From a paper:
By using cryogenic electron microscopy (cryo‐EM), we determined three structures of the DsRC‐LH1s purified in salt‐free, Mg2+‐containing, and EDTA‐2Na‐containing solutions with global resolutions of 2.7, 2.7, and 2.8 Å, respectively. When equal amounts of cell membranes were dissolved in solutions lacking salt, or containing Mg2+, Ca2+, or ethylenediaminetetraacetic acid disodium salt (EDTA‐2Na), and separated by sucrose density gradient centrifugation (SDGC), the DsRC‐LH1‐rich components formed deep reddish‐purple bands at similar locations in the gradient tubes, and their absorption spectra were similar. However, the negative staining analysis showed that the stabilities of the DsRC‐LH1 samples purified with different conditions were significantly different. In particular, the DsRC‐LH1 particles exhibited stable forms in Mg2+ and Ca2+ solutions, whereas most of the DsRC‐LH1 particles purified in salt‐free or EDTA‐2Na solutions were severely disrupted. When incubated at 50 °C, the DsRC‐LH1 samples in Mg2+ and Ca2+ solutions showed higher thermal stability and the relative intensity of LH1 Qy absorption at 867 nm decreased slightly within 90 min. However, the DsRC‐LH1 samples in salt‐free or EDTA‐2Na solutions exhibited a significant decrease in the relative intensity of LH1 Qy absorption. However, in the DsRC‐LH1 the residues αn‐Asp49 and αn‐Ile51 are replaced by α‐Leu46 and α‐Ala47, resulting in the inability of Ca2+ to be stably bound at this position. This is consistent with the observation that the DsRC‐LH1 samples purified using Ca2+‐ or Mg2+‐containing solutions showed no significant changes in the absorption spectra compared to DsRC‐LH1 samples purified using salt‐free or EDTA‐2Na solutions. Since we found only two possible binding sites of bivalent ions in the DsRC‐LH1 complex, the stabilizing effects of bivalent ions on the complex may be mainly through non‐specific binding to the surface of the complex or the residues distributed in the gap between the reaction center and the LH1, which may also represent an adaptation to the marine environments where D. shibae has been found to exist.
Numbering used by the authors:
A (entry chain C): 156 to 258
B (entry chain O): 8 to 59
C (entry chain D), H (entry chain E), I (entry chain F), K (entry chain G), L (entry chain I): 2 to 52
D (entry chain e), J (entry chain f): 6 to 49
E (entry chain L): 2 to 275
F (entry chain M): 2 to 326
G (entry chain H): 1 to 256
M (entry chain J): 2 to 51
Write the structure that this text describes.
């Protein structure tokens, strides 16, 4: 109720998603290997696909963040930090930036 | 000159025709304009070179 | 008193054109300042008075 | 006999008399204008 | 003071308006009718900035921020401490920039030279005009102009750029940025030829226009010439100023969606197979 | 109106100029094949003269093509050798740098291995071209200002792709080889490390980038304004100052209180352009290695503006009011 | 490193202050390099001024001029200074314009003022004169645009002063520099040069707007019909540009 | 006093232009400063006293 | 003393212009600084005493 | 004997006396202005 | 001593400008440093004393 | 010992200007370094001592 | 030894200014590095003894 009743009493009904269709529109699948010859960060990042929002940003942003509980925050919380391995890089920022053109 | 510029004028005139012609049969303005710009450079350039 | 000597150092035709421009821009600026306000906008007051 | 502008001593003495007459007249109106404003809304 | 050769050029006349009433020099500067207006407007705008800084509570040049009114006020006038001071400075800034360009016309008219410099400055004014009055007029509020702060006006650029979700995909930004990176490239290369030819290795004769002309022929296979580089150099800079005006006047008055979505015309062309 | 010298009103074409020569024997490596283009001659020189090909020029061109092919042919393979799809997605495809998990080690070919090999050839091609510029100036007995200015550009080129990844200890910090992807990297780079607007060197580099376009518009228009006095012959005006150099100097002296000489203008021009990547190279080097968050650095050093107004749209309007209902 | 030296002064802060010191030295160097010509300042009367500026004059630098023309140390006495200028001060002080004492276009003052350059032609790499008529040039011809040879010349007031007889080119750069004008007997006597930047070429005529019909007879002439010296170039060009303000009183007086 | 000697070093037609800009700049600036204050704004005081 | 010799070092015309600009910018700065504080801002005090 | 401005020894001596007279008058008004301000709102 | 020989090295009319700018910039900078500290800020102290 | 020969190599005018600028900047840096430290800041030390 | 011949190659004017700049920047850089370390920061160490 903290989201669907945020400002007023709007709520969600069966018509909110379907809008008169058997299958709701704007449903997404996992197109993870958008690229053939590449693997890793390069296999999700260099194509204009349906989930990339007309950009060359990662297409797995919805899969990793809205289904797999991956960490979205990438900034450093103080003026100077020690860059220990495993910290978010510009690749993680770019995947977050892909998810957020979708928001 | 007086002929290269004239031939360039025919190219830009054709590009305007190409833009509206493709919009009539569907497409879109930007999609039509791109082929109109492309037709301007090719046909207009060829005319200025093929005949002077 | 004896200010007529101002024309001994300033060209009469050049000053007149300059102060003609200054007077109009000053006049237009003050008129526009009044129009910006709500109390002294005679255009909006007419609508307010006419119901 | 320093004169950077070429004006003689009598020339500038008579010019300064007119300038100060304008300065006092300009200051006199400002004093009256300031006096009226202080009565309207004092700032002290 | 003068220069070793300045005296023979300081002749009377050439003014656009005011004649010899203002036709004199103060130090090295030339004062004209538009030099009087420039002094008035620039000083008035400068003082008002520091008056607003005094009421803002800080005089730190990094932190001084005079901001436009809210979008609610529309195109009308706003209270001076609630965004009206910004509007007055904008009028003063426009008056000072136009007067500066018109003053340059008088100077170059007195020297019997071309009017290329004032015309080039007008493109810079046009870019400023299209940011502060032209674009706000189309968008319907004076609050769409950037604030007058050293670091505050970067925050306006950051938010305006991200208001379209990716501002690098703007087709006019793509063209305009290409002109800066090339104009600087042209400036670096042109300034290198004259310096290299006029400053050869010690003990060597200076080089003429032929030597620098054949250097780029040897280097990139084509040389534009001594006249061509300035002629094309002005065009690159003027196009840079013009196209930068285009990229911001179409962001909001002509395009409201994200800029990556603009390229959907190319992706979904009928020619491309599905 | 008066003729503005923006387009030549008449062109004269004679025998092709093969260029000057000295004891260094420049002519034996020249192509001696010239062509004249009248279209480009309306604004500049109309001769597409011979190009000097040596060994630094040949090595750079061959290695540069290898980088072009390796990046390009990988992109073609990425869309399954579909030419219509290769053209359609041309601005979106790239050769992504290695994944961060591999550090500075050599990654697999499909996961950035070809990126390192391609980057190796690009590094060779760029450095070879710099040597050609340095060698040509030495053979022409001219100053090395072209090489030094180009070395300034390479400094940002090296920092952006070679020096900084080594300092961070990861090849993943390089720039992807794509049209749109290196714009995505540019935006993501600023977001990851705070706000790159608040980098003092990024601010300083913008000062010299704006100044470069500022000064070349000022210099380009001034020379065109004095070209009626033979102002386009800048070199002869340095050796024997004519009325063109005097009026150009006096125009700016009367405008902004000080001027330059016909030689000194090109020292200002050289230094603003050279300082554009030199300052930016330092700013990129400090980003990630030292700071890791630029806005917080600005807050710490007290040059981040503070705002007192509210943030939500509910503090300025309503949803119904915006929709006009 | 993420450790500060003192307070909040890290490596990034240190590099900023190093650039500030370097930039201050760079500005000092750049400005002094622009003072090689035109200094000391002097005043309106010709005497050296009491003020000379915060930047001292730079050390002497030498240019090894080619074609056996000697050396040139820029900081020093200027050989381009003109003497016996036909001007008088309009005020007893400083900062006021000078008024010509005669014909400004003939005396060469203000917009019509030239500079005392060397009285020798500019030379190309080989050493031959840079600017020559196309009659002497071999293999040169008009490849684009309108050929102005033979077209009548129309002055700034509409008078026809003659027809273009020849046209001088820069064979080193293959660029047109001047047009020869065969003055009519009613307007002049011989040939005159006009630079390409003050002429607009039409289909049937070439128009020069800076000079009226009566001002063409006083255009400076060249000593020889095959080459033009640097001094003659500077005198010819200054005359035409001086007509943009001295052709008639309407140009000199304010337009508004 | 002998302040009249100031015209032996300053030309009258270059100083009068100097103070002409300066005097109007003061008149414009101080008027604008008062208009920004909430107490001395005579334009909004008329609206306030109008109730 | 011999402080009068400064005019043999500095031109009186340029010093008088220099201090004329400096003194006004001095006067403007200090007046603005007082207006920035709360205790010495005579515009706010007048409003405060009005109550 | 030394003068970069061209003024003689007596010319500068006469000029300084007038300049110092203006300096004292400007300072005298400032002292009165400051004294009135201290009574209005002391800053010490 | 023999420090008077400095004017045989330094041009007098350029050093005086240099120190005139330096001395004022020094004075303003030290005056501003005191204002930053709350102990020596005489403007904020006067408000506290008035209470 | 024989260090006076340094003036046969360095121009005294150039060195003195550089040394004068270097000495002040060095003095300002060391003074500012002391202010950053909490133990040698005489401005903040007087505030604590007064209390 | 016979190192005096190095001045036949190097210009004393150019070397002396370069050495002077290098010597100060090195000394300032070392004084800064010590201030960054906790053990050798004599300003913070003086506070501890108080
Ligand atoms: C806050 C309460 C009052 C207020 C309080 C005051 C007070 C108090 C004063 C003023 C003063 C003035 N106010 Mg007010 N003022 C208010 C609102 C206004 C409004 C308005 C629309 O609301 C206006 C128009 C003005 C306008 C003015 C001017 C009359 C005057 C300032 C002169 C100056 O700055 O320029 C002058 C500068 C010039 C150089 C301009 C000259 C330009 C012309 C064209 C030059 C021509 C010269 C030419 C050669 C001919 C020469 C001939 C001579 C005879 C030789 N005030 C509010 C309502 N105002 C001040 C004043 O000056 O009083 C005398 C004054 O003391
Ligand atoms: C969201 C985006 C971020 C951003 C992120 C960055 C990043 C990231 C960088 C910059 C940097 C730059 N930014 Mg920024 N910047 C932003 C906002 C701005 C704004 C603005 C109005 O908002 C502006 C004007 C700028 C301007 C600039 C320039 C000052 C500077 C680039 C230096 C340069 O010239 O590169 C020119 C140099 C190169 C192009 C390399 C040259 C390569 C070699 C020499 C050539 C090889 C050629 C190659 C082989 C191909 C040849 C093929 C031929 C066909 C044969 N930024 C925002 C905050 N900015 C750069 C910087 O920091 O500098 C300190 C940088 O790395
Ligand atoms: C905070 C309490 C008081 C306050 C406290 C003080 C105190 C205390 C002082 C001032 C002083 C001044 N105040 Mg205050 N002041 C306040 C509010 C104001 C207000 C206002 C609207 O509220 C105004 C207009 C002023 C204005 C002024 C000026 C009268 C004066 C500063 C002169 C200066 O800076 O530049 C000087 C300008 C110049 C040097 C250039 C002048 C330019 C002219 C045009 C040049 C002409 C030269 C030409 C050759 C003719 C020469 C002829 C001569 C006769 C030879 N104050 C508040 C109300 N103010 C200071 C002062 O100067 O007192 C004398 C002073 O000591
Ligand atoms: C072709 C486009 C390029 C260009 C060209 C250009 N600019 C020019 C010229 C030319 C050809 C000139 O001839 C002219 C000149 O004479 O320069 C020395 C000029 C000029 N462009 C300048 C600056 C400038 N140019 C810039 C860029 C560019 N101008 C483009 C790259 C920039 C940017 C984008 O950063 C700046 C800041 C000046 C050096 C000069 C204009 C001087 C002038 O207008 O003087 C009159 C005004 C004053 C002395 C002060 C006015 C103060 C205002 C009244 C108040 C403040 C208003 C302002 C909005 C403040 C905002 C502050 C914050 C944003 C921090
Ligand atoms: C920093 C200030 C400016 C600057 C300066 C600068 N750049 C410079 C210089 C300078 C001073 C040079 O001297 C140098 C130069 O040569 O200029 C002409 C250069 C240069 N910087 C360049 C561009 C450039 N400048 C840039 C920016 C800038 N550098 C600023 C605008 C940028 C950007 C925006 O990052 C770029 C991309 C180059 C044009 C040039 C030197 C690059 C070069 O030639 O590298 C060698 C590489 C090759 C010869 C080949 C490259 C790849 C080819 C595309 C392959 C061939 C393909 C072909 C179709 C064959 C296909 C075969 C198959 C079908 C089999
Ligand atoms: C089942 C549909 C549903 C989904 C899925 C959903 N929302 Fe909502 N959201 C709603 C409803 C219903 C409201 C209306 C609440 C109101 O404003 O009173 C709302 C309101 C909002 C608001 C508040 C807008 C306002 O005007 O304050 C935001 C922002 C928001 N959603 C964002 C998101 C984002 C981001 C996501 C994806 C993570 C998301 N929502 C997923 C149903 C949903
Ligand atoms: C927020 C959206 C959401 C809401 C609420 C919603 N559904 Fe669904 N529903 C889905 C999704 C997602 C699917 C799976 C996609 C599909 O099958 O096309 C689905 C699938 C279904 C299908 C099967 C579609 C098929 O292909 O046959 C049915 C039946 C169904 N929904 C019934 C309902 C009914 C009845 C309601 C009203 C209570 C409802 N749903 C409300 C999201 C929702
Ligand atoms: C409806 C508001 C919404 C919109 C639209 C939005 N943001 Fe966000 N953003 C969020 C939320 C919620 C989070 C928090 C996720 C987390 O912290 O787990 C977030 C987090 C982020 C992060 C991570 C910051 C940190 O905590 O490290 C970045 C990067 C980001 N946003 C950038 C953007 C960009 C760029 C856009 C413009 C395309 C954008 N956002 C648009 C809601 C939004
Ligand atoms: C930011 O802070 C805040 C607090 C907001 C602020 O406001 C700060 C305020 C500050 C700093 C006030 C600064 C103001 C100062 C210092 C006041 C200068 C004002 C002066 C000096 C007044 C001159 C008056 C001159 C006239 C008006 C002459 C009239 C001339 C007449 C016309 C005579 C000429 C005519 C002739 C005929 C000549 C004779 C000719 C021959 C004989 C030939
Ligand atoms: C940031 O910090 C905070 C704390 C905020 C701050 O405020 C810091 C304040 C700081 C640092 C104070 C800086 C101020 C200083 C140093 C004060 C200098 C002020 C001086 C020196 C006063 C000159 C007065 C000269 C006049 C006014 C002469 C009048 C001239 C008359 C008119 C004579 C001319 C007349 C003639 C007839 C010509 C001469 C004769 C002949 C030609 C014959
Ligand atoms: C970074 O943080 C840490 C690490 C903590 C740090 O702080 C590092 C500190 C570091 C590195 C200290 C570096 C300091 C150094 C190196 C000290 C140099 C200082 C020197 C050398 C002192 C010269 C003084 C010379 C004078 C004062 C001359 C005055 C001359 C007078 C005015 C006479 C005029 C001269 C004449 C000749 C007269 C003319 C005569 C004739 C013409 C006959
Ligand atoms: C039809 O023809 C065929 C051929 C088929 C084809 O496909 C056509 C080709 C096509 C279309 C490809 C089009 C190419 C495109 C779009 C590429 C754009 C390129 C862009 C934007 C460049 C980004 C910036 C790069 C930086 C900033 C590098 C910096 C890194 C440098 C290099 C430093 C060195 C790096 C190292 C790692 C060193 C490694 C060395 C050792 C390990 C020793
Ligand atoms: Fe140039």
């Amino acid at each position: 109720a903290g989201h669907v009743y945020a400002n007023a009493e709007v709520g969600v009904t069966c018509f909110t998603c379907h809008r008169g269709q058997a299958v709701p529109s704007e449903v997404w699948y996992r197109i993870d290997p958008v690229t053939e010859n590449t693997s890793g960060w390069a296999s999700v990042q260099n194509r204009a696909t349906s989930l990339s929002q007309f950009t060359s940003l990662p297409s797995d942003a919805l899969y990793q963040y809205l289904l797999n509980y991956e960490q979205i925050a990438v900034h450093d919380l103080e003026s100077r930090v020690e860059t220990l391995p495993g910290d978010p890089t510009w690749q993680n920022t770019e995947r977050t930036y892909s998810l957020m053109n979708y928001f | 000159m007086t002929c290269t510029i004239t031939c360039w004028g025919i190219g830009v005139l054709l590009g305007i025709m190409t833009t509206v012609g493709l919009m009539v049969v569907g497409w879109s303005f930007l999609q039509g304009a791109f082929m109109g710009v492309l037709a301007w450079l090719i046909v207009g350039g060829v005319l200025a070179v093929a005949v002077c | 008193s004896k200010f007529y000597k101002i024309w001994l150092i300033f060209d009469p035709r050049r000053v007149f054109v300059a102060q003609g421009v200054f007077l109009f821009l000053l006049a237009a600026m003050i008129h526009l300042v009044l129009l910006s306000t709500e109390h002294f906008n005679w255009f909006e007051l007419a609508a307010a008075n006419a119901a | 006999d320093l004169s950077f502008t070429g004006l003689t001593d009598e020339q500038a003495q008579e010019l300064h008399s007119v300038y100060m007459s304008g300065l006092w007249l300009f200051s006199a109106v400002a004093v009256v204008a300031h006096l009226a404003t202080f009565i309207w809304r004092p700032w002290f | 003071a003068l220069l070793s050769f300045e005296r023979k050029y300081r002749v009377r006349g050439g003014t656009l308006i005011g004649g010899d009433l203002f036709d004199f020099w103060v130090g090295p500067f030339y004062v004209g009718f538009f030099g009087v207006t420039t002094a008035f407007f620039a000083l008035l705008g400068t003082i008002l900035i520091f008056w607003g800084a005094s009421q803002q509570g800080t005089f730190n040049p990094w932190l001084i921020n005079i901001a436009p009114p809210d979008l609610s006020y529309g195109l009308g006038m706003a209270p001076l401490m609630e965004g009206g001071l910004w509007q007055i400075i904008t009028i003063c800034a426009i008056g000072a920039f136009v007067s500066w360009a018109l003053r340059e016309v008088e100077i170059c008219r007195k020297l019997g030279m071309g009017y290329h410099v004032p015309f080039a400055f007008s493109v810079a004014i046009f870019a400023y005009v299209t940011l502060v009055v032209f674009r706000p007029l189309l968008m319907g509020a004076w609050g769409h102009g950037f604030p007058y702060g050293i670091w505050s006006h970067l925050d306006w650029v950051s938010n305006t750029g991200y208001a379209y979700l990716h501002f690098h995909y703007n087709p006019a930004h793509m063209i305009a940025v290409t002109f800066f990176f090339t104009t600087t490239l042209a400036l670096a290369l042109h300034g290198a030829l004259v310096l290299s030819a006029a400053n050869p290795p010690k003990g060597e004769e200076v080089k003429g226009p032929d030597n620098e002309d054949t250097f780029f022929r040897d280097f990139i296979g084509y040389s534009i010439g001594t006249l061509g580089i300035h002629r094309v150099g002005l065009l690159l800079a003027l196009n840079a100023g013009f196209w930068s005006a285009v990229c911001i006047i179409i962001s909001g008055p002509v395009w409201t969606k994200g800029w990556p979505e603009w390229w959907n015309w190319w992706l979904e062309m009928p020619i491309w197979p599905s | 109106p008066e003729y503005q010298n923006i387009f030549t009103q008449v062109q004269v074409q004679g025998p092709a100029e093969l260029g000057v020569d000295n004891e260094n024997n420049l002519t034996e490596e020249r192509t001696t094949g010239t062509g004249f283009s009248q279209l480009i001659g309306w604004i500049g020189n109309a001769q597409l003269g011979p190009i000097y090909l040596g060994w630094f020029g040949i090595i750079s061109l061959v290695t540069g093509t290898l980088w072009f092919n390796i990046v390009g042919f990988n992109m073609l393979s990425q869309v399954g050798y579909s030419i219509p799809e290769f053209i359609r997605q041309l601005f979106w495809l790239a050769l992504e740098p290695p994944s961060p998990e591999y550090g500075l080690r050599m990654p697999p070919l499909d996961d950035g291995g070809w990126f390192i090999i391609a980057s190796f050839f690009l590094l060779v091609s760029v450095i070879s071209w710099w040597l050609r510029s340095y060698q040509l100036a030495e053979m022409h007995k001219m100053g090395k200002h072209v090489a030094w200015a180009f070395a300034a550009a390479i400094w940002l080129f090296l920092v952006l792709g070679l020096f900084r990844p080594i300092l961070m200890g990861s090849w993943s910090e390089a720039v992807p080889y794509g049209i749109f992807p290196h714009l995505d990297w540019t935006t993501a780079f600023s977001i990851r490390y705070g706000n790159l607007y608040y980098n003092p060197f990024h601010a300083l580099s913008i000062v010299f980038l704006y100044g470069s376009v500022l000064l070349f518009a000022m210099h380009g228009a001034t020379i065109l304004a004095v070209t009626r006095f033979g102002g386009d012959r800048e070199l002869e005006q340095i050796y024997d100052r004519g009325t063109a150099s005097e009026r150009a100097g006096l125009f700016w002296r009367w405008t902004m209180g000080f001027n330059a000489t016909m030689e000194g203008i090109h020292r200002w021009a050289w230094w603003f352009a050279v300082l554009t990547p030199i300052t930016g190279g330092i700013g990129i080097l400090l980003t990630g290695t030292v700071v890791d968050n630029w806005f917080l650095w600005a807050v710490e050093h007290n040059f981040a503006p503070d705002y007192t107004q509210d943030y939500g749209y509910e503090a300025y309007t309503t949803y119904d009011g915006f929709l006009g209902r | 490193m993420e450790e500060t030296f003192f307070g909040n002064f890290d490596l990034a802060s240190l590099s900023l202050w190093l650039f500030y010191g370097f930039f201050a030295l760079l500005i000092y160097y750049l400005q002094t390099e622009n003072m090689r010509e035109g200094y000391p300042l002097e005043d309106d009367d010709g005497n050296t001024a009491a003020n000379q500026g915060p930047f001292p004059l730079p050390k002497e630098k030498t240019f090894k001029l080619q074609h056996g023309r000697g050396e040139l140390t820029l900081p020093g006495e200027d050989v381009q200074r003109r003497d016996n200028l036909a001007l008088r001060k309009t005020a007893h002080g400083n900062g006021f314009p000078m008024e010509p004492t005669g014909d400004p276009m003939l005396d060469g003052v203000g917009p019509a003022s030239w500079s005392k350059r060397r009285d020798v032609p500019e030379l190309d790499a080989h050493g031959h004169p840079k600017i020559v008529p196309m009659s002497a040039a071999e293999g040169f011809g008009v490849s684009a645009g309108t050929d102005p040879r033979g077209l009548p010349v129309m002055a700034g007031d509409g008078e026809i002063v003659g027809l273009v007889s020849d046209m001088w080119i820069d064979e080193a750069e293959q660029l047109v520099r001047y047009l020869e004008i065969e003055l009519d007997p009613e307007w002049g006597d011989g040939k005159r040069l006009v630079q390409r930047e003050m002429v607009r070429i039409k289909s049937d005529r070439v128009k020069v707007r800076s000079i009226y019909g009566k001002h063409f007879k006083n255009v400076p002439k060249t000593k020889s019909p095959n080459q033009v010296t640097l001094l003659e170039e500077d005198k010819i060009m200054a005359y035409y540009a001086g007509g943009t303000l001295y052709a008639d009183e309407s140009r000199l007086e304010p337009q508004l």
